[PDB]
Design a binder for these strands. Structure first.
Lengths: 224, 212
RNA sequence: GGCCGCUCCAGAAGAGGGCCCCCUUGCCCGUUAUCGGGGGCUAGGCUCGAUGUCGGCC
């Protein structure tokens, strides 16, 4: 019944600007105060800004006082977050949320509907395609059990990459680790499989890396 | 002063059927102006409790909250499969609103030792001028493992990074990767590279090495 | 010394105000907005007063 679709986020360099838009459905903005809350990667939640469209009253966190501007447009039943002079500590998923207005309540309460968040990345990195190296089965396997092998996917930007093994023909035992931002602003990631050591000789293992935001497509054979 | 919300524990393991409690202390009194939220990975928070103990509509009655001074408790009477997620408290007695870091509610299972695998850098990478040494810890539990890198018996710091899967969809284990990145110059100055793993399921450390 | 006054300066000066704890808002209240009552600390810091070691005038 109630909906909150956010949009307008993405990738931007420090100093740059962005406009988030939280389109609401099923309720009127004038019966609500709207809020932006952010979740930096791996960290908790934090409140950015709020607005009450019925009155125009607005409020901001201190870290973003003077750079961000919340605003509403009730004819489009939509709220906006204008973000200027972005630093890298503004990188986060940005969730808008609603608190319903109740004429008997005397003050605002919890955030009772949330939208699914947009991602905002503030890096100086420039979109680059990944380099694929093989992670070879050891030339010392225990002789009669399982082996491990994989693909190393290094130096790509931005996320996400997607890995598959033998073009999807191999899913059992596949682990693709979450990507890691190295000390150079680029991402790195590994994907590994366990297979029987017997199959090492007479089964060829090829992983398929695909990075969309740079239209890259690799295919690496893994072999002793 | 911002009223801060401090949440413990950071995580915990339980099983379907368990009674589960999470707590959150406020830097100072917030009277009853605490709410509790549920969030599943990469998905929106949902509101469970407001006014420290009121059940927001549609929130299954298994959820309860209570107050003890500046201590706030969220309790799942009998734990369902849907309820493993991260839980956050929030205090709105004084603007600005503020959140605790969250309690992550993980699946309990038995201890499993990691199978450890070590991978030298590829000749391809070695030409580009860098060397990545990967060390893999497969299907272990609980999450707390330690991977110490030893280069010629010398212990390393600052030059590696770890990533860990979420709990496996079928057996609820973890897998972990640690990559020790060097420059090509440094990799060939040395001879023996070792990964040393310590975990509950391992009575003594598991070391795996190679030379070149 | 008289009369006036508070623009300034005093702190020699009340009352606002503020801070913390309790009561699920609990006399009446309440900005699309977090109060009231109770308990405890705040003084020269802000507003308003009062005052003179201040200012003016005859």
């Amino acid at each position: 019944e109630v909906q909150l679709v956010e949009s307008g986020g993405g990738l931007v360099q420090p100093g740059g600007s962005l406009r988030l838009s939280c389109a609401a459905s099923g309720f009127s903005l004038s019966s609500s105060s709207m809020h932006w809350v952010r979740q930096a990667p791996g960290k908790g939640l934090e409140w950015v800004a709020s607005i009450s469209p019925y009155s125009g009253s607005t409020s901001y966190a201190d870290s973003v006082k003077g750079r961000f501007t919340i605003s509403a447009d009730t004819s489009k039943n939509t709220a906006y977050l204008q973000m200027n002079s972005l630093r890298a500590e503004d990188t986060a998923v940005y969730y808008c949320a609603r608190t319903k207005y109740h004429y008997k309540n005397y003050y605002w309460w919890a955030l009772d509907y949330w939208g699914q968040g947009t991602l905002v990345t503030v890096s100086s990195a420039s979109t680059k395609g990944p380099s694929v190296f093989p992670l070879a089965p050891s030339s010392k396997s225990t002789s009669g059990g399982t082996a491990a092998l994989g693909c190393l996917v290094k130096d790509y930007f931005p996320e996400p990459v997607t890995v598959s093994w033998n073009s999807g023909a191999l899913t059992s035992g596949v682990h693709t680790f979450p990507a890691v931002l190295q000390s150079s602003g680029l991402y790195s990631l590994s994907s590994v499989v366990t297979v029987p050591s017997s199959s090492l000789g007479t089964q060829t293992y090829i992983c398929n890396v695909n990075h969309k935001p740079s239209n890259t497509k690799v295919d690496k054979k893994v072999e002793p | 002063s911002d009223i801060q919300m401090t949440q413990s524990p950071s995580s915990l393991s339980a099983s379907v059927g368990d009674r589960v409690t999470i707590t959150c202390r406020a830097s100072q009194s917030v009277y009853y102006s605490v709410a509790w939220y549920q969030q599943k990975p990469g998905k929106a928070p949902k509101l469970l409790i407001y006014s420290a103990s009121y059940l927001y509509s549609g929130v299954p009655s298994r959820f309860s909250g209570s107050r003890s001074g500046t201590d706030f408790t969220l309790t799942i009477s009998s734990l369902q499969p849907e309820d493993f997620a991260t839980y956050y408290c929030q205090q709105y007695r004084r603007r600005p609103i503020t959140f605790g870091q969250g309690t992550k509610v993980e699946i309990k299972r038995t201890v499993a030792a990691p199978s450890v695998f070590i991978f030298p850098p590829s000749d391809e990478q070695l030409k580009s001028g860098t060397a990545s040494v990967v060390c893999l810890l497969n299907n272990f539990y609980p999450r707390e493992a330690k991977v110490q890198w030893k280069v010629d018996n010398a212990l390393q710091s600052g030059n590696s990074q770890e990533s860990v899967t979420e709990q496996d969809s079928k057996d609820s284990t973890y897998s972990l990767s640690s990559t020790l990145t060097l420059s090509k110059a440094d990799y060939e100055k040395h001879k023996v590279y070792a990964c040393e793993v310590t975990h509950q399921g391992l009575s003594s450390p598991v070391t795996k090495s190679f030379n070149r």
